[PDB]
Amino acid sequence: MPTRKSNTYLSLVNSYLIDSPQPSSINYWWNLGSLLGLCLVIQIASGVFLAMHYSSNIELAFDSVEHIMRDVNAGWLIRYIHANGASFFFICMYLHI
Amino acid sequence: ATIFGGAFAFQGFFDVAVNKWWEEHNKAKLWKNVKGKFL
């Protein structure tokens, strides 16, 4: 069998991405799920890069966020992503519902 | 692979195009162009 089916890991990846027998008449709405998954990555990805700089102490939380925005190299980008990407995560989730 | 190297071509092309258009659209506003007046 092809490597994309013999190997269990690639077999799973195939069953879900490469050979998943999707119906032929699905609109673009059925893509929202993927976006949601994409957003779940982004929320996590940017998220993991904010905790590397976010300090959870109450006297430091807001100052730490401002340190991210002002001092970290791309910190403004990471915060704006992690926030507007949550807003878009919920846009896509409401569209998926 | 050649994907890694080729990505540099497009990244550099767009980066230089934008970093040459931006300092032309905004040349009257950037610092490096205004600093002369206040020196």
Binding site: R70, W76, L77 | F10, F14, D15, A17, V18
Partner: protein, 46 residues
């Protein structure tokens, strides 16, 4: 908003890249779907 200038320059670069890439994706999808949107069926029972 000290990142304003850098933020908008990065945004311009991102829009250029993503808009070109989105047009390319549109073209590729329409092209690879031409076989499906051009399917023609027949049903000829006795």
């Amino acid at each position: 908003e000290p990142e304003h200038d850098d933020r908008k320059k990065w945004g311009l670069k991102a829009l250029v890249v993503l808009s070109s890439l989105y047009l390319l994706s549109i073209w590729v999808k329409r092209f690879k779907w031409t076989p499906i949107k051009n399917r023609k069926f027949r049903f000829d029972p006795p």
